[PDB]
């Protein structure tokens with residue numbers, strides 16, 4: 001689920017940032033109410049992603065790491081092709097849940113393509129001028 | 131404009147282009163929804179002046195419809211070009227098309243042109259995929 005993925009992504013980031021994740025911090029991070037959070041935490045607990053402060057299971061840590069990687073990759077991709085920095089976060093937040101792993105992997109190869117030769121970025125920039 | 135509303139406009143535009151007209155029953159079939167749901171959305175589109183309730187698109191509806199079909203086709207071409215398995219392309223495009231700003235669409239447009247103007251670039255991309 002897209003929303004469930006947003007939660008796991010955020011929880012993982014808080015644990016890496018503060019060392020733990022409070023219901024209050026999750027609520028403010030997703031701009032939602034603490035009641036909503038608690039309801040999701042129960043489902044995640046039952047699905048074995050975390051125990052409940054709240055601790056992630058090996059399963060939750062694996063998925064969390066993957067989601068943060070996916071988010072970071074997509075921001076890097078949009079940045080490389082020249083998207084206005086101010087529009088990147090909201091676009092990534094919207095598309096990240098609707099891309100298959102096959103698409104993410106191919107975008108990964110695309111980012112690598114442009115990173116291995118700066119002349120390629122200049123050629124892309126040229127077309128943007130025209 | 132909402133994502134589902136965009137899905138309706140895109141579909142109506144294509145039916146008019148393919149069959150010459152858009153019936154409520156054909157829209158229901160294409161989106162796999164009940165006709166009541168379609169009728170409700172069509173009244174909202176009528177209210178926002180995208181069409182007149184057969185179904186006739188206004189200049190505003192034709193403009194947006196054309197734009198949405200363009201966006202769908204561009205994104206399919208983009209995923210195809212970078213090597214995504216053909217069977218997964220439609221589903222990915224249907225989901226992301228609504229969440230990309232025009233700025234992103236324009237830049238993806240330049241990217242597609244980039245690979246399309248020199249086959250050598252496509253070969254280099256495929257080479258990395260082999261690493």
Ligand SMILES: [Mn+2]
Pocket residue numbers: 009071092093096
């Ligand atoms: Mn994200």
Ligand SMILES: [Mn+2]
Pocket residue numbers: 006092093094096097
């Ligand atoms: Mn998101």
Ligand SMILES: [Mn+2]
Pocket residue numbers: 140202223224227
């Ligand atoms: Mn579409």
Ligand SMILES: [Mn+2]
Pocket residue numbers: 137223224225227228
């Ligand atoms: Mn769609």
